[PDB]
Amino acid sequence: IAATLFVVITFVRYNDTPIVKASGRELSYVLLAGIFLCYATTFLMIAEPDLGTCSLRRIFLGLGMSISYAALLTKTNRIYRIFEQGKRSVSAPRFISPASQLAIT
Amino acid sequence: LLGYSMLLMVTCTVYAIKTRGVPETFNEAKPIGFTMYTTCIVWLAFIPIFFGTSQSADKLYIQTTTLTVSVSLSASVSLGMLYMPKVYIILFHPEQNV
Amino acid sequence: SAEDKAAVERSKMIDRNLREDGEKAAKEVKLLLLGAGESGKNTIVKQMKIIGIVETHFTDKDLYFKMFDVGAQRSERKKWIHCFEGVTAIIFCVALSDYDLVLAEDEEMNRMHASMKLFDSICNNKWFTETSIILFLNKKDLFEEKIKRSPLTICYPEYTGSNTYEEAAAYIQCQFEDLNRRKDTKEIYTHFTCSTDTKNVQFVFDAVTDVIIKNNLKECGLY
Amino acid sequence: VGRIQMRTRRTLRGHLAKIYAMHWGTDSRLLVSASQDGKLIIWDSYTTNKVHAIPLRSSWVMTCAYAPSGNYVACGGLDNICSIYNLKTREGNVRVSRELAGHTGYLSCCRFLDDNQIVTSSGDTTCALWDIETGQQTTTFTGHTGDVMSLSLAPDTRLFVSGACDASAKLWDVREGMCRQTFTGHESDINAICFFPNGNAFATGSDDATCRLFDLRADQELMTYSHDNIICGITSVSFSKSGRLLLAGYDDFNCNVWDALKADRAGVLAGHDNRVSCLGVTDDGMAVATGSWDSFLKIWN
Amino acid sequence: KVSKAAADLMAYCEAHAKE
Amino acid sequence: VQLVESGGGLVQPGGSRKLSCSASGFAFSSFGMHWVRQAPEKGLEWVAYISSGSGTIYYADTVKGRFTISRDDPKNTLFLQMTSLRSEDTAMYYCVRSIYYYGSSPFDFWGQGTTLTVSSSDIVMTQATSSVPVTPGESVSISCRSSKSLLHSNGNTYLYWFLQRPGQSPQLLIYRMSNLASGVPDRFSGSGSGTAFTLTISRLEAEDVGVYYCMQHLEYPLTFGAGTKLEL
Ligand SMILES: O=C(Nc1cccc(Cl)c1)c1ccccn1
């Protein structure tokens, strides 16, 4: 959790840097929130196994094993298309727009 | 859930190895494949300890602890060895940030 | 409604043709070719032939290029170029063989500075400052047959260096590439020319590809 | 008159590239537009369908024209030839009739004087009068100081004005071919040219937000319709059939409408996400059309 | 020109029912 | 610009025979193709219609699987694919060229056609008073009936006017809204208020003997006049 907080603080402070722009700044907060949920499911499991807590454990696990690797997968696909299409056309590979990537994720 | 995650990991790996020709500025291919393999190793280590301690004491102490440890380890590997090099370059070497 | 339905269906049939025609136009890359008076702007178009605006078409690595010349058109250049907004790459051709002249036969300016007065203007008007400005260095072979004669001090008084190709070549980039008051978005692709080789069209493909890639990267906040 | 803001009854989609041309026929039902995709498209606001889509030999076409009888269409552009297309053909498809060559200057306005005569004006500082039968310049209008790119005709088909972007505003004649009247005093290059429906007034639109009108009988500056806080330019201008309404197309992604004497804004046609380069009003006076660079055509009625 | 502007008192684009 | 019918006809009684008319000198790609059929004695009636791109497959009220239409646009020709036979098939089949847009003149040029002999809601619009023997110069007038109004709220009347010389292909005189079409000569006009239409030809001359038609085009099912019998 401390490392994730440091990462988000670094990424939002220098939000105009090309290196953070090259990493998919739009599809980076989603990945970091997914890692945060993957961390927080440990705290949730530590707590009492109430009905609400039992449901929340499953919800957090299902969301966390998937959201991070979908944000990463989506980013990879987008970058590959950008360069791949640019090799033969100028009208963009497809909906690489940040709202589109969010929608795909 | 683990099967869906592993399928997503396989798609991520095939995508990473498809997009290996990108220059070093956006070369998020080797770290992504490395992270996929590390998560696969973590889950393949989780499987035996989780699924073997069935008819034994401290099943609750073993299964939940090993599952949350594996989840935390995968998340830590992904977050660290995905972004920590970039944070290092940003705020420890203020010369490649342009 | 039989005729109205047929008329409506006629528009749909035409709309399908527009999409097919638009798809070909979308993948087609527009190239702007310009230069000064006999500044080598006509020598480049004769290179990628086998492999008043004139238009030439050629294919190079699954790309449909199209040049739009300006030498044959004489009008107010700075006010009809708005139609060329969105052109992916603008090829500028200058020959390194005319850095001297008896005035200009129309004003008081040598060809070198006159060409530099067009390269800077074409990269400063608020129409083309989005993608790139591709530069071509023509008359590369004949440049050596004039550098050991009267040096660049004739055109460039502040020239302080050697009298060889290596020292001169580095200067040429400074004269032309360092003509942008803005460098965050615009880039200059300075690269020489070959008289009888196919490397000239090779520089066209990757440079146009590079700006195409950066165009997608610049959009969506990823570059 | 009032504050008639806007009314977008319909939007003519389909276009992909920027539009610099739009003309309306005498039937008050057909519209013709041009685009940089090399596809000249004829529209109609009553049904909103593509009645004709004739491909363009030059993708840089910057002008359009419709014959008074609705039988011919013309294009210009940075190609120096006027490709005349006959709409009414036995074969059905739209084909070129004659290419008017011999300008050596960029083309941005070629209005149809009649079914046989063309008043093509080029960017080589000289205008011309063309004949369909022979395909040669019957008249050789010369005397301007700069390139002219916008003309406007008159209902009587006996007078026209050629205005270059150098404060020329020279008034020519169809037959004798000399500058009968000249108007000077403009502080910037002009880009929009219109004619009064009555045929006794003449206005200009320049790249300085100073849309002004003059008089044919007396050469003096009328009301200049001073802008309040507009710093952009004007690309197109047109007059309604009423004669008490001024419509101009501005570079600030919108259009403005004034009155004959009030000289104040009477409505904003901001519905386009780009600068407006086309404007026209039907000869009857019903509905208005607007073309812009975002490849979108809309009808204001 | 003033008379011509007001000549078409029954013009359009102000108030009508036709399209 | 020139259409002639071929493919066969009168091959044998009771045997199916598909026929097709050859076309030339026009696009056809953006052209509607009809298969309007003429009765052996009098009456030219419509049975099939295909539009550009084969989108429109409107058929006659005598709907049957044997009646099909195929646009040979690539060949600029057309297909019929006739199946079986019937006593109604003894007829005179023609070919029609038509286009649909504002200001267009559908049903302009018709082919010569061929005779196919076989052995062993709607406006209908039949010219009731189709018998007026008058010498040239008498300003012939032909009146056709109409069950309901032919104005589909568009301000124009979807009615076509024809002229069929003996032994020659029918020629359209004035298209919808009573306007000249097909480059035919002048003095061809005629209009009416509603459900009542008349023919106005003044300065009458020769080369107009034959049969006249009155066609409606409100919707899919088309109809024409049974027959006009006005001669010199
Ligand atoms: O034990 C492991 N993987 C595994 C997973 C399922 C069944 C079985 Cl027999 C073995 C393993 C994985 C990684 C490193 C060390 N060890």
Which atom of ligand 1 lies closest to the CA of B42? 13
E14: left (phi over 0), alpha (psi -120 to 50) or beta: alpha
**CA atoms of D214 and E18, how far apart (whole Å):** 33
* φ/ψ (deg, to 5) at C70: -130, -10
Q: Are D212 and D202 in contact (CB under 8 A)?
A: no
Nearest CA to D162 among D174, D154, D152, D176? D152
b/e string for F22-46 if b means 16 or more Cβ within 10 A?
bbeebbbebbbbbbbbbeeeebbbb
Question: In chain C, what residues touch A19 (CB-CB under 8 Å)?
Answer: none
Question: In chain D, what residues touch F109 (CB-CB under 8 Å)?
Answer: 90
Q: Are D120 and D107 in contact (CB under 8 A)?
A: yes
Burial class (CB in 10 A: 0-12, 13-18, 19+), A16: exposed
**Nearest residue of chain B to residue A35 (CA atoms):** B75
Helices (H), C73-139: 77-80, 111-122
> Measuring CA to CA, how many Å separate F206 from each of B2, F138, F149, F202?
92, 11, 33, 12
Q: In the numeric block, which tokens belong to residue F50?
A: 């295909």
Can you say how many angstroms the Cα of residue C204 is from the centroid of all Cα atoms in its chain? 10
**CA atoms of C93 and C36, how far apart (whole Å):** 8
Q: In the numeric block, which tokens belong to residue D180?
A: 């009968």
Q: In the numeric block, which tokens belong to residue D274?
A: 């780009």
Nearest CA to C40 among C100, C101, C91? C91
Can you say how many angstroms the Cα of residue C30 is from the centroid of all Cα atoms in its chain? 10
What are the boundaries of each domain within chain D?
1-300
b/e string for F146-159 if b means 16 or more Cβ within 10 A?
beeebebeeebbbb
Whose alpha carbon is nearest atom 7 of ligand 1? B48
> Measuring CA to CA, how many Å separate D102 from each of C77, D55, D128, F136?
20, 23, 10, 54
According to DSSP, residue F48 is labeled: B
> Could you tell me the strand order of the sheet in which F49-50 lies?
F49-50, F32-34, F96-98
Q: Are F93 and F38 in contact (CB under 8 A)?
A: yes
Q: What is the dihedral of CA C68, C69, C74, C78, to 10 degrees?
A: 60
Map tokens 């002219």 to a residue: D148
3-state secondary structure D82-139: EEEEECCCCCCCCEEEEEECCCCCCEEECCECCCCEECCEECCCCECEEECCCCCEEE
User: CB-based contacts of D136: which residues, under 8 Å, 6+ apart?
Assistant: D102, D130
**CA atoms of C155 and B28, how far apart (whole Å):** 48
According to DSSP, residue F88 is labeled: G
Q: In the numeric block, which tokens belong to residue C149?
A: 């004669």
Extended strands (E) in F18-131: 20-24, 32-34, 37-38, 44-45, 49-50, 91-93, 96-98, 114-116
According to DSSP, residue A82 is labeled: H
Nearest CA to B66 among D52, A45, D276, A25? A45
Asked if the D1-300 domain carries CATH number 2.130.10.10, the reply is yes
Pocket mutation for ligand 1, best pick of B2, B38, B44, B50 (most atoms within 8 Å of C-beta) = B44
Q: Which chains neighbour D (Cβ–Cβ under 8 Å, 3 or more pairs)? A: C, E, F
From C61, C62, C221, residue closest to A98, measured CB to CB = C221
Nearest CA to C115 among C129, C105, C104, C130? C104
**CA atoms of F145 and F214, how far apart (whole Å):** 9
Nearest CA to F140 among F198, F180, F227? F198
User: CB-based contacts of F193: which residues, under 8 Å, 6+ apart?
Assistant: none
> Measuring CA to CA, how many Å separate D64 from each of C25, F39, F224?
22, 49, 41
Residue type, D216: L
> Measuring CA to CA, how many Å separate F83 from each of A8, C82, F15, F89?
76, 62, 8, 11
Is C119 strand, coil or helix?
Answer: helix
Find the helix or strand (DSSP H, E) in which C58 lies: strand C55-59
Half-sphere exposure (Cβ direction) of C194: Cα atoms closer than 13 Å: 11
Residue F177 Cα, gap to closest chain D Cα (Å): 15
Nearest CA to B80 among A31, D170, C137? A31
Map tokens 């003095």 to a residue: F187
Nearest CA to D204 among D191, D217, D216? D191
Chains A and B touch (3+ CB pairs under 8 A): yes
* φ/ψ (deg, to 5) at A62: -60, -40
Q: Are D1 and D259 in contact (CB under 8 A)?
A: yes
Nearest CA to D100 among D52, D136, D71? D136
**CA atoms of D216 and D186, how far apart (whole Å):** 17
Angle, vertex CA C62, rays to CA C59 and CA C67, nearest 5? 40
**Nearest residue of chain C to residue D102 (CA atoms):** C52
b/e string for D228-261 if b means 16 or more Cβ within 10 A?
eebeebbbbbbbbbbbbbbbbbbbebbbbbbbbe
Is F187 strand, coil or helix?
Answer: coil
**CA atoms of C220 and A100, how far apart (whole Å):** 10
**Nearest residue of chain F to residue C17 (CA atoms):** F53
* φ/ψ (deg, to 5) at D53: -135, 90
Beta partners for residue C91, in sequence order: C33, C134
3-state secondary structure chain D: CCCCCCCEEEEECCCCCCCCEEEECCCCCCEEEECCCCEEEEECCCCCCCCEEEECCCCCCCCEEECCCCCEEEECECCCCEEEEECCCCCCCCEEEEEECCCCCCEEECCECCCCEECCEECCCCECEEECCCCCEEECCCCCCCCEEEEECCCCCCCEEEEECCCCCEEECCCCCCCCEECCCCCCCEEEEEECCCCCEEEEEECCCCCEEEECCCCCECCCCCCCCCCCCEEEEEECCCCCEEEEEECCCCEEEEECCCCCCCCECCCCCCCEEEEEECCCCCCEEEEECCCCEEEEC
Long-range contacts of D138-143 (CB under 8 A, 24+ apart): D139/D174, D139/D177, D140/D177, D141/D172, D141/D177, D143/D170, D143/D178, D143/D179
User: CB-based contacts of D243: which residues, under 8 Å, 6+ apart?
Assistant: D196, D197, D198, D260, E1, E4, E5, E6, E7, E8
* φ/ψ (deg, to 5) at F147: -60, -50
Residue type, D20: Y
Q: Are D229 and D191 in contact (CB under 8 A)?
A: no
Considering Cα of B47, then B51, then B56, then B60, what sign does the dihedral take?
positive
Q: A18 and chain B: CB distance < 8 Å anywhere?
A: yes
Is C137 strand, coil or helix?
Answer: strand
Can you say how many angstroms the Cα of residue D204 is from the centroid of all Cα atoms in its chain? 11
Resolution of this model in Å is 3.4
**CA atoms of F149 and F194, how far apart (whole Å):** 6
Extended strands (E) in chain F: 2-6, 20-24, 32-34, 37-38, 44-45, 49-50, 91-93, 96-98, 114-116, 144-145, 159-164, 170-172, 174-175, 179-180, 196-197, 214-216
Which CATH superfamily, name and number, covers F2-116?
Immunoglobulins (2.60.40.10)
Q: Which chains neighbour C (Cβ–Cβ under 8 Å, 3 or more pairs)? A: A, D, F
What pairing do the DSSP bridges indicate for beta strands C89-95 and C133-138?
A: parallel
**CA atoms of F122 and C158, how far apart (whole Å):** 93
Can you say how many angstroms the Cα of residue B43 is from the centroid of all Cα atoms in its chain? 9
**CA atoms of D33 and D20, how far apart (whole Å):** 8
Helices (H), B19-93: 30-52, 59-91
Residue type, D153: L
Q: In the numeric block, which tokens belong to residue F107?
A: 């049903």
Q: Are F34 and F60 in contact (CB under 8 A)?
A: no
Find the helix or strand (DSSP H, E) in which A57 lies: helix A51-86
To test the contact with chain E by mutation, choose from D4, D5, D244 the residue with the greatest count of E C-beta atoms within 10 A, namely D244
Nearest CA to A73 among B6, D296, D1, C215? B6
> Measuring CA to CA, how many Å separate C106 from each of B35, C122, D152?
67, 21, 35
Question: In chain D, what residues touch C17 (CB-CB under 8 Å)?
Answer: 53
User: CB-based contacts of C64: which residues, under 8 Å, 6+ apart?
Assistant: C24, C27, C28, C29, C57
Please state how this structure was obtained: cryo-EM
Q: Which chains neighbour E (Cβ–Cβ under 8 Å, 3 or more pairs)? A: D
Q: Are F50 and F57 in contact (CB under 8 A)?
A: yes
User: CB-based contacts of B52: which residues, under 8 Å, 6+ apart?
Assistant: none
Map tokens 């509603």 to a residue: F194
**CA atoms of F174 and F184, how far apart (whole Å):** 9
To test the contact with chain A by mutation, choose from B79, B93, B96, B97 the residue with the greatest count of A C-beta atoms within 10 A, namely B79
Q: In the numeric block, which tokens belong to residue B14?
A: 């095939």
Map tokens 């047109």 to a residue: D238
Using only C-alpha atoms, what is the Rg of chain B? 17
Q: Are D167 and D184 in contact (CB under 8 A)?
A: yes
**CA atoms of D247 and D231, how far apart (whole Å):** 17
Helices (H), chain C: 2-27, 41-44, 77-80, 111-122, 140-147, 165-176, 199-218
Pocket mutation for ligand 1, best pick of B47, B49, B74 (most atoms within 8 Å of C-beta) = B47
Q: In the numeric block, which tokens belong to residue D271?
A: 């519905």
